[PDB]
């Protein structure tokens, strides 16, 4: 039996091949998550079919609908059997899907186009001169929405009452918006994507401050699926062998198309 | 029903109070781990009595007996219900106990005695003989060893990377013994080994020791790997999922970050 | 019985909220005095309806008429029960109303338009034409005035100190009138007089305006005197002692200074 | 009828002149408080006799006996009719005595030996190398005792568990102790006394940091006394006339026996 795999087009996690028009099958996709899925299949001993979500979203609860979108929806409603992607582990997700051990650490980061008067997010909240936004249907807006810290509460109140809309459809669109804003806009994304962007050419963006929280990406499985334990063991074993570190170095720092 | 919480006397996780002679019960201890246990008990209602492992060992397999010893061992045999302590999540441990999501990240680091200033117009620069694990393996004048019955020793034993393989080869056949019985033992060996000994230990304890007086030691190089501390639980226990959700919730509120800052950076000096 | 609280539309004490067009009740306002009144009502339980003075005046006794106008007047004549507002404690007001212990210190200061930095090896030095009150009275090119029907004007009118007597003599007989009807109007006059008008106002308001955008005004010299803001209460009322105890408790608990810091220094644009 | 006035021997509030053995009556005392009492008597129109409290105590509640000692006890128990002294206005005091308007502002300050390593209260509390103490039976210890702020709670816990006794009977003895500690002792006292000490020879002590809070000195009268309103009006009139400022300048900076 073939296990269907859902994943999002995220760099450097899943990329579209430069010759993907003439390429078919699992060889048409490449990236960190493609390699992760290949090793997971090899360790578990199953055949997998790579698929891309119809909606370019990670997953969130809708407004008064109780409906999951993105990969979480593809997993809960029986449309998929596993999800290998940068899916942040969150309480509102673990209650509906099975999360494996984190295969990559990360945090909330601030990315700003090139004295550094922004520094930490505290001064970012204290000053309203520059507008900042996040990604819709992810884990950053969800983190800001249910935060009990007063400072994060003020940031979220600014986020919701933003004119015009500050949330961006895709992280690439957010990168383009901050690039073309001439330093008037800031983007709140995760540490891994922030590093991958600020380190790739043309290196016109940068990461300021630190990490507002500590999170991780996990392999997601349907609630009650028998594949959760094998993929958890596979992730643990790959961590012991340090293959995750080698994949991170290959897809992040091996090329290094910048002067650093 | 009261559930016994196995733990280990490790700073700043679990430390005895200054007035611990007159005190009794759960008030005998302080640090990160006792606050973590209090938060876990607040999340899901249970009665817990703090206990310390008799042998003071984190957990590993014995020699030719296939017997689990230490925290993991006494969790498997039923002597404890939950292990709220800096237990490292590993492959072998997960096969016999249930781990939760990591509540704190860590890596394997190198601790050496802090050298003196260069003092050569008038600038004092710090020169260290060891800057990474590779040159530590290449060199021979400085000895290095890990803590026995711990995750670092088991990681070096099964490592297939060439640098780590040769490191483990040296450590296995090192005369005299380079392994230590406790973290404080290795720290003392580093402190009064005249810079001839290096300690391979977790990053968090390394920063804790480096941040406190007399602070005559420093951490060299980056982290050898990336692991985390998880709350342990026997297979099939009803506590697993509630504790996992409690750890997730505490991570979401930033309680873990606040506890780490309060017990690591706030009380720092030098 | 619901008591009526009288305030004044003064920043950052009582400020109109952005979404105040669709808001009814005590949620229309924000600032320092609103939460001060909230804490007062939490200490001594009562229901309060925040009201704004009709004429927007702090309080003064009109000569040859013997009628108090403004917040003090409407507190005296029975149409008010408590005045939680930046009302300055004075000798004349105390004889007619009950004041509590001061909840925030203050002093009379001078506000001038911030001058341009001096070009001359490459240091930008800041030169101001007025540095105290003695030279402000000695000079004549820069006019100065106070707020009408305020504490500062009454202080200058009855002042027997030579410099203050000269200042009051100049202000009383001056064409055009140097007195202002509102603090914001005086600040606008200072900003649009091209440095030819100095405003005599309280130190708290002056510092708040200096700390906020566009940051084109500066405070010169020290405070001319030392006074305080007190919660007003009609003479022979039952709310005086509980309000005084509440003010003392808030001062000792750190509510007052935390509120002042979070409404003055936290939102510092410049 | 002669109004009995109680006061404490505090500088520059009350002094025993320089040849008080040859002087009798109110002519043998000098200071800020003596002048203040003189103006109070002039405004109210009464004859007063200056007396020094037998116990050098500002006033506090004893060990589970509910007894006031010092000037507050001298007023509550009918021993005196008024107290002109640096009596800090405190919430617990106001419940038993009538306080006038504050005639002198102040705050809690830190006085150390002559970039300080402690400066702020946070660093001083964190650093346990140097012991810090307050005045026994005053108001600083009372303020620290009932502080619910975490930092001040930690400082108070350090205060109570101090070996040997860090509290000092008299502020002059505290000054002597810090002068005889080689910078190993810090004294927590009021801003006015700290400034007066640091602005007098030989000027080996300095004030560091800001003020922990804002207090004031009041003129205390027995509960339900007819003198409270006249002395309150006198204080207001003196403040409006600027006499209090001139007295502070006379007794704090006019002499200026320091190099600065
Ligand atoms: N350096 S990294 O971000 O690519 C990275 C991050 C992590 C890795 C492995 C790597 Cl290579 N493994 C850990 C896992 C291993 C075991 C201990 C913690 C989890 C379970 N999670 S992690 O701390 O999120
Ligand atoms: N900054 S830290 O080391 O105290 C720290 C480290 C970590 C935290 C939370 C904190 Cl505060 N939570 C994460 C967990 C939360 C969810 C996402 C990854 C795991 C599941 N693990 S972690 O990456 O090991
Ligand atoms: N720092 S401040 O201006 O916000 C400020 C100023 C003052 C405060 C409290 C604060 Cl937070 N309390 C005092 C009062 C408290 C008790 C002691 C003096 C009076 C009665 N008045 S004050 O000296 O006018
Ligand atoms: N500059 S000072 O410390 O000598 C000083 C301090 C103060 C003075 C007067 C002087 Cl001179 N008067 C005020 C009083 C006057 C009226 C307003 C507040 C009280 C009632 N209290 S105060 O703000 O504590
Ligand atoms: N990987 C994140 C993306 C959200 C973000 O871009 O912040 C998630 O699954 O929610
Ligand atoms: N924290 C480790 C022990 C310390 C070490 O091995 O260095 C564990 O839980 O296994
Ligand atoms: N705060 C003053 C008014 C302001 C002023 O006079 O400058 C009062 O209550 O009277
Ligand atoms: N002057 C204070 C006591 C002195 C101090 O606390 O340092 C009082 O009246 O209580």
From Swiss-Prot, chains A, D:
Residues marked Crucial to convey clamshell closure to channel opening (site): 118
Keywords carried by this UniProt record: Cell membrane, Disulfide bond, Glycoprotein, Ion channel, Ion transport, Ligand-gated ion channel, Lipoprotein, Membrane, Palmitate, Phosphoprotein, Postsynaptic cell membrane, Receptor, Signal, Synapse, Transmembrane, Transmembrane helix, Transport, Ubl conjugation
SS bonds (residue pairs): 203-258
Transmembrane listed as a keyword: yes
A molecular-function term among this protein's GO annotations: protein-containing complex binding
Primary residence: membrane
Function: Ionotropic glutamate receptor that functions as a ligand-gated cation channel, gated by L-glutamate and glutamatergic agonists such as alpha-amino-3-hydroxy-5-methyl-4-isoxazolepropionic acid (AMPA), quisqualic acid, and kainic acid. L-glutamate acts as an excitatory neurotransmitter at many synapses in the central nervous system and plays an important role in fast excitatory synaptic transmission.
Name of the featured protein: Glutamate receptor 2
Source organism per UniProt: Rattus norvegicus (Rat)
Organismal lineage: Eukaryota, Metazoa, Chordata, Craniata, Vertebrata
């Amino acid at each position: 039996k073939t296990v269907v795999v859902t994943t999002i087009l995220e760099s450097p996690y899943v990329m579209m091949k430069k010759n993907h028009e003439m390429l078919e099958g699992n060889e048409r996709y490449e990236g960190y998550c493609v390699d992760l899925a290949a090793e997971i299949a090899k360790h578990c001993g199953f055949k997998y079919k790579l698929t891309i979500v119809g909606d370019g979203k990670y997953g969130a609860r809708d407004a008064d609908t109780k409906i999951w979108n993105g990969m979480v929806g593809e997993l809960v409603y029986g449309k998929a059997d596993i999800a290998i992607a940068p899916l942040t582990i969150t309480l509102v997700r673990e209650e509906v899907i099975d999360f494996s051990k984190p295969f990559m650490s990360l945090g909330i980061s601030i990315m700003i186009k090139k004295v550094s008067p922004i520094e930490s997010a505290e001064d970012l909240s204290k000053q309203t001169e520059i507008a900042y936004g996040t990604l819709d249907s992810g884990s950053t807006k969800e983190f800001f929405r249910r935060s009990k810290i007063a400072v994060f509460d003020k940031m979220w109140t600014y986020m919701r009452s933003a004119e015009p809309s500050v949330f961006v459809r895709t992280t690439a669109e957010g990168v383009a918006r901050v690039r073309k804003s001439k330093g008037k806009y800031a983007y709140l994304l995760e540490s891994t994507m922030n590093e991958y962007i600020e380190q790739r050419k043309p290196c016109d963006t940068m990461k300021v401050g630190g990490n507002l929280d500590s999170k991780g990406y996990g392999i997601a499985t349907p609630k009650g699926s028998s594949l959760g334990t094998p993929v958890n063991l596979a992730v643990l074993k790959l961590s012991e062998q340090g293959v995750l570190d080698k994949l991170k170095n290959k897809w992040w720092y091996d090329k290094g198309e910048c002067g650093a």
